[PDB]
Assembly symmetry: D3
Homo-oligomer: 322 residues x 6
């Protein structure tokens, strides 16, 4: 019942995309569970457990499509449930919460680094790399390859409606990496000069499909058409365990006003419908590798990642549920 103000604030900021990026929203939800445990006023273990269940729900019900977020909450809450059920007292429960969130947030940082170090080995001197949206994991790859002294260049697609290519362009330029900035429709037109495509992921499924920013699948299609390697930089917590048992991943339909600003859109007639999918599905046949913190896999090995690290939990209900 008694939820801190930071949990609510994190939720509002994830919903609104003030905070965004699959990896970042996951860390932000771990963080919010950390703070709820730190600042809790509860006296019983039962009453902390109840606050953590509710803050978890509040954070789960922000954005559907990126499984990183649910996975972050599970990382904490599996550990919190097993403590509460194993009979821990208040402070042992509170530490379990805080130190689990801390581990996740730390593992997320190290994994993004390691993904960089590993993807970079596939970038050769002189490469022209196309990317899409703004993915920390993809950027960690391009960044490390530059620092290795490879003279790379990155074709950045503006990525409508939310324009996150701008973020990517300025970030890459800031490290000294030259950028070619283009609208999304130019991807095919520039694929003939591209050597590598490198993008992120919000969720990766049992059969190896990659759910990522709207337009990703298009870029992968023409990449394949041209024999340009498509490389998906993604952490193991981007892999989606409900899919092993048949679950389809919800594609988030965001507000039409992101596409057409409110002032303008109110003047349009009723029989125009603005549709704003935030993600699309890229089939595994159009992906050459997925680069996780544990190494290069072909996308069809997504099921191995899911088996060895998440399978166990699918016989149990969700670790924030009553």
């Amino acid at each position: 019942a008694m939820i801190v103000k930071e949990v609510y604030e994190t939720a509002e900021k994830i919903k609104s995309m003030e905070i965004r990026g699959a990896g970042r929203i996951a860390r932000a939800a771990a963080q919010a569970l950390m703070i709820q445990a730190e600042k809790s006023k509860a006296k019983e273990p039962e009453e902390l457990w109840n606050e953590l269940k509710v803050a978890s729900k509040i954070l789960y019900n922000t954005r559907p499509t990126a499984v990183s977020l649910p996975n972050a909450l599970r990382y904490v809450m599996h550990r919190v449930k097993a403590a509460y059920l194993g009979g821990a007292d208040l402070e042992t429960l509170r530490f379990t919460a805080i130190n689990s969130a801390k581990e996740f947030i730390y593992n997320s940082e190290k994994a993004i680094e390691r993904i960089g170090e590993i993807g970079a080995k596939r970038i050769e001197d002189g490469d022209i790399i196309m990317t899409h949206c703004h993915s920390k994991a993809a950027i960690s790859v391009m960044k490390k390859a530059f620092e290795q002294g490879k003279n790379i260049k990155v074709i950045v697609t503006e990525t409508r409606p939310k324009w996150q290519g701008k973020i990517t362009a300025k970030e890459l330029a800031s490290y000294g990496i030259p950028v070619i900035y283009i609208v999304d429709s130019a991807a095919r037109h520039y694929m003939k000069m591209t050597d590598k495509v490198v993008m992120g992921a919000n969720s990766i499924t049992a059969n190896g499909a990659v759910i990522n920013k709207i337009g990703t699948s298009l870029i992968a299609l023409t990449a394949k058409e041209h024999r340009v390697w498509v490389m998906i930089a993604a952490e193991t917590y981007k892999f989606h365990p409900a899919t092993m048992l048949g679950q389809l991943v919800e594609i988030e339909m965001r507000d039409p006003t992101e596409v057409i600003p409110e002032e303008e859109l109110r003047t349009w007639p009723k029989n125009i419908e603005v549709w704003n999918p935030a993600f699309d599905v890229t089939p595994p046949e159009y992906i050459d590798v997925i680069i996780t913190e544990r190494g290069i896999i072909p996308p069809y090995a997504a099921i191995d990642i899911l088996k060895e690290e998440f399978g166990w939990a699918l016989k149990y209900k969700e670790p924030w549920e009553d």
Copy 2:
């Protein structure tokens, strides 16, 4: 030289895309040679011939990619040059020019209406049609299909950078046609629900390729992927003579600020280049039919349309040349 106001105003409105659309700029270019010949104060054929030569040059030197523009100038000036070299006095030459240009304008209007009637027979009741940019020819097909009582819906892509899709969406909604407005990036995601794709052309080459608004090649590519018919609606003067003797069509690179506004681009680091190609090249394999005003063709029959209608002029210079 002594060129009329309306030749400069038209040429600069083509340049700024205040007047746009491959058809319309071709009518506008004819309409301007027309007003030059109307208001010319020359007192001698050779003086007016020289006026019309120079007005043509100015109109050619505006935008390069849509061969519709030079085909319109060719249409007036092949005739004006034949009359002048024949011996025509002033009023004969003036009438030749004025009338030639009226023919082209009337023929362009009729050709478009015709393309709509033909193309609409390839549209079936219940069809969801995806389009791109704003093409009068493609709209003619859609409009006509709807007037025939086929219950259609058109998926309109916004069409970055210049947003012509906004025009398309308001235009079709105003004729009664339900519109689904999406970003260019969503073309693959929504290709599964799409029955037909209907797009325009700016240039059609000898070997069947179609130069049309940037992103056309992506839509076409993924339409092939999904076995959706790609129909290109295009008047015969969209077809490109010079491609018969090996000519590559230039792709217009327009100003970076169409993508990133001036107020913002000036703040961006020097090592980001913004690249804004106005068109791309869709290869023939991804096109099912080109609809002309003389009927349905496979795209590899573009050489026939050009052999029969344009071939004769390629042993000559341009009809505005010294």
Copy 3:
């Protein structure tokens, strides 16, 4: 008003498929117009013309999909109309009818022969040929190749629902050609041992698609997948002129009882719907050549055939119309 009994009988037999095969039903409709003219009791030219208009309609409204039939009727009726309108008397009109039908029927026979002679040159000694349905034009090819002394073998697909493979099997066996008879679902399974596919056509369209017996498109798909040449044996009157101006070809939906016999089908519940398309469309990308009486063309040249021999008539309404 006064229509002979043979016209009605031909119609009933075309509807029912007692007479069948694109080529044969065309000759049978020429024949029926022949007999109506031969036996007519009319005294005025106006009154023969009126009987021929009506018998033509009766024959047009038998089966939609095979354009051979409409083309046969036009071959006669274009010539009859131009005579009647040019002022011919009764007997001159009657001869024009009879002798036009005679020419068509003769040209049909010679064309099927010539198609044989030309297709056969593409059959090599030892070839294994898959066919589908029963096509005289396809059979003329296999037959001639055998008589040339090539030791061929033909995989005949049974061709459901109407089982016309049986006809093909017995006919080929009768000339001494060995046959492998298979259900339609085995086509892919046996494509690896097949050297050539050779099928007929009911209608061929402007952009080069081939409308032929249901299942043709499937056979062509896997043929292409395997690099097995697909050869369509077809007369110029199989080419469909309404398509040059955008017309879609009606696919005939025949009686469900052809699939499931009446005795049985009456016992099935209402929420099962038997659907019986008689034809499908094979796209031109899956056809290597069309073999007409005038030679080998790639399917994209279907528009050339249509242009040079049928284009002229599309400005006029139908030559049996009032």
Copy 4:
């Protein structure tokens, strides 16, 4: 040797396909070793072990392609052989056999229900699903989807020669599900309206190929063409151990008269051979997922299912061998 009536009656009902379906014949084969051990009058382990050996041989030697049958025999007899070689007395061995076979039967029933629950999550409301033959596993998915209130329709292919599609259509219509019944040949024509394909398996090989009813490879091929998901519903005992060490799966050639009835075939010329393969091989590339009772896999993960569940037995002989 002394074999019970029910072993012969079952073996000959498998042979005649009076009992058919890869699952069902596997349950039937277990059910027969069960009834042998029940009613055996042996008074000594070695006598009963020899009875069960010989009953197994007889049951193996019925139909070769569906590895479900020998996996069922392996399931009983690996256990029966371990007990006998362990020293088990008569009643221990008899119980081992009787109970082993009951386990397999209970597990097969549960596995199928489970596959339906998992697979139905990949089915969406409004989906038109095309199926082939009659597969209990595929039907489980469809049935379950419908019980979940997804408004579906199933296109059922009749499935020549043996017409199993009739069974499928009456079965789904009797649970309330609207059915569209078509011939195998119409699969491509109706693939454009199809959202999902759901088919069963008889054998799944190490490299991911799927041996299933003849025609499956065509449906799959053209589903890929159109980007329709191909889902194969298959229990883990449909997976084929021996393919791990290079074994080609034999394709069952059944009797010509299943195609052409005896009354008719006897009248046909000697130079027609009728070829009736019962199955074909769909390669992994054309399959999106295999749905097992342990979840969704890419088809290239069939080696994992076999490494983990079957690998150990390949250094041994069959558990019925001398």
Copy 5:
């Protein structure tokens, strides 16, 4: 007949490939017809006609695959035969042979020079160009583009067995064009860096296939795979008129000693057969353009080139026949 030595030397040097290339050998058969006529000791017009018919057969029976050679003999002998049947006296006939030969020889040189100018327009500055064998038509494109100031590099495949890549390497190096020389097997490895492919043609068939040096089809395949333009530079006399009536082009099989020298091959055992096909067949779908002296065509308009230039001649027997 009294056949001059120069005819027998030309045939010998064509069989041995001392004189080679489809154009070159065409010119050489014209040259030799020209010399038969110039040096003939024939007193009567009957006697010269017979000497030329015989010289023509001799030349035709050297190398079957390149149609250029017989098309040359036609050009002369069609004209020599019209003269003779029209009743020409001796010196009239002799001159017709001589001036027909000289016409063909001059047109060949023009056509090749003009293919250069047309083709060069498709080469863009910076281009890397892969070629195969030694084609004068291909070399004229590459040479002309270099003379226009475009910095190119050419990847010359060595072209086994006869090593003609060596002739091409030295030839392009001698015009100042940098060459990269590689074994045939490396064509795919280096296709990623290739911008354009440019090759010649020995015969081009009615549906667009290009018969050219063994290996041409593999380069074209991987070229397509990587979306690299494949351009065939071919005079109109390489188009194969017999193919319009279904004829297959024979693939010349040459001595096994070209592959393994005789010192070595004689030691090898009998159960090694060495097969040396001199040409293969590229299908039209892997060819983007044929460049002829009259323009750029898609491969599918090869039939138009044939209909309009050689199609007349197919109803008559070969000029040199009686």
Copy 6:
């Protein structure tokens, strides 16, 4: 260190390719480590360790592309290093080197013999088999299938530049297998008649790509094109462990004199560069199976072979390092 002559002779004969094949050179580096140990004059365990580390570096720096060679050196030196760090005395260490070498050499011979038996099961009587270079693993499949009584023929591509096809041709002819010998360029021409492709492998990466003799990827491409199985016969020590952490496999570039002999090359001009890549990269989508000594895997499970056998070793530095 005191390195024995046999180590320096082995390195020299590996660089010059006098000893070649990925397996063979692996065994030869083991053999040489074995001889360093056998003939060592080292009085102390420190001194032998240093002599082996140095001999290992020498052997590693011969030919980079074949991972078999370093994987052999690992097998020994991992074990030699465990002994030394565990504190082993001299003769303990020396034996560990000798018995580790002998272990690897015996396992290699077994693995190849066993690949033969597994692979042969996929060869079917009548098969025509195309191969490339000279692979002992591929040859063992083909040999074993012939010894099983299956009548096969093998198409041996000559494999330029080093002509290893000659070694394969004589070798298979010597077991009584008929060979068809052809230039590399003819692979597509003869793929129509080929039933199976069987080739070796120098390294196999984490996502399934196969690095093998230059040309391998072209054969695999056209094989895929024609639906011919491509089978890679490769021991588990050809799988490349460094690729799991993103490393790219280096392509050895060898002397240009292998392509053009020095007598001739010295005469050629400087602006001809001769490039001699020894390997190319076949992507996994063009490979149907890898045959290892432990079974058949789809190319996408190369990662499982690596995880389960070599994955442990990646956190440590190379055994021969300090």
